[PDB]
Amino acid sequence: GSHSMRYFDTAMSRPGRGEPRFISVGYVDDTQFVRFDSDAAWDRNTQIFKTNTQTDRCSLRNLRGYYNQSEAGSHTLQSMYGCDVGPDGRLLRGHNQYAYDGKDYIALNEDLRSWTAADTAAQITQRKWEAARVAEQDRAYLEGTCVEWLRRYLENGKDTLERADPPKTHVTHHPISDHEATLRCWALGFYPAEITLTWQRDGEDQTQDTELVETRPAGDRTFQKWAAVVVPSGEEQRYTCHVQHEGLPKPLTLRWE
Amino acid sequence: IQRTPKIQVYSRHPAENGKSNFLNCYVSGFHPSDIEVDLLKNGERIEKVEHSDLSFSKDWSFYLLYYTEFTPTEKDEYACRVNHVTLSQPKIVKWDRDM
Amino acid sequence: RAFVKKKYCL
């Protein structure tokens, strides 16, 4: 399959409660492989996390000034970076982007050479990073180091990271009244998290009438999802649930009973 | 600006009365990241509940999984209680083995 | 060699 390495970093100020917390979590696909938390009680990687803590604190101080903000409030800087590769291990694309207080701030474009800034504050960052040739350093990491490490981790972890576990599926039925019942189509035990779960009525998608819960972790590496439709009593066999997942040898068509 | 949490409460494995399992409360879609999550057994806070490392989706919204060992029975009620800056009062979602 | 990326201050 295709694979991703991605870091999810959160820095959050907390005036009067010490310096901003920094947490960095790294993933290969839906599997966490590292965490660094500045609040938690190999040397070269730890050193880069510790320096990154300081860098994100610098960032938060600069951002407060770019938006004329008071020293009283808490603010959040998030970052996502890493690489996507195909089944052959070749680079598909790199990522390096930021959000401040939940709003997109700046992103490295797909070219790995230029920046997209959301506002006049992010333009300041953009000019600074252009002056310091930051993109060239990010590009070297994303094309070089990130792709090489992801290929090594995939090979070393091939029995889990390269194994797709199909969903275990069933349909449940619950009357809501004399006139209507819920049909719920379940997918349990799958990995990776990407899945398509849909209801059809007479072979027409029921997007508007389907309740689809967010895919959710089970805690054993696997994921769960369901999709429900309310159907008239007696009409259950007109409804089909369709399941697509990388671990299935073929897509599933399920009905009640 | 602020996004209120989505909450799901569910078991790791299919629920069987008298068989040991894990009770999960998955909170997602929220911003900012500070959040308080308790798991409840017959209305009482369960002690030593663990949680995942803070992460977020590609839309920047945070998610956490809170979890504990539990042995479901016919009698015992389980729930998850969540507070966030977006909520005027803690939100309780009851464990239903069909959701 | 390192798997973590060096970050730059915004």
Numbering used by the authors:
A (entry chain A): 1 to 41, 60 to 275
B (entry chain B): 1 to 99
C (entry chain C): 0 to 9
Which passages does the manuscript contain on this structure?
Antigen presentation by major histocompatibility class I (MHC I) molecules is central to adaptive immunity. MHC I molecules bind peptides and present them at the cell surface to specific receptors on CD8+ T cells. MHC I molecules bind peptides in a groove that is lined with discrete pockets (A to F). The stability of MHC class I molecules is highly dependent on interaction with a bound peptide ligand.
A close examination of how the FV 20mer peptide binds in the A pocket shows that the main-chain nitrogen of P1 Phe is rotated in a position that is normally occupied by a canonical P1 side chain, as seen in FA and FV 8mers. In this configuration, the P1 main-chain nitrogen forms a hydrogen bond with Asn63, and the extension residues P-1 Ala and P-2 Arg protrude out of the A pocket. Interestingly, the main-chain carbonyl oxygens of P-1 and P-2 residues form hydrogen bonds with the indole nitrogen of Trp167, which likely stabilizes the peptide backbone as it exits out of the groove. The structure also shows that the bulky P1 Phe side chain cannot occupy the canonical position of the N-terminal amino group, i.e., the cavity formed by Tyr7 and Tyr1711, and the phenyl ring points toward the α1-helix. Finally, the main-chain carbonyl oxygen of P1 Phe forms hydrogen bonds with Tyr7 and Tyr159. Specifically, the FA 20mer structure lacks 6 residues from Gln54 to Tyr59, and FV 20mer structure lacks as many as 18 residues from Ser42 to Tyr59 - electron densities at an acceptable 1σ threshold were not visible for these residues in our structures. In the FV 20mer structure, however, because P2 carries a larger Val side chain, the P1 main-chain carbonyl group cannot similarly rotate toward the α1-helix and consequently the P1 phenyl ring is positioned further away from Ile52. In the FV 20mer structure, however, the P1 phenyl ring is oriented differently and, as such, it cannot engage with Ile52 thus causing residues Ser42 to Glu53 to become disordered. In the FV 20mer structure, however, similar molecular cross-talks between the A and B pockets were not possible because of the larger peptide P2 Val side chain in the B pocket that positioned P1 Phe side chain further away from Ile52. As a result, a significantly longer stretch of residues became disordered in the FV 20mer structure, generating a widely open-ended A pocket.
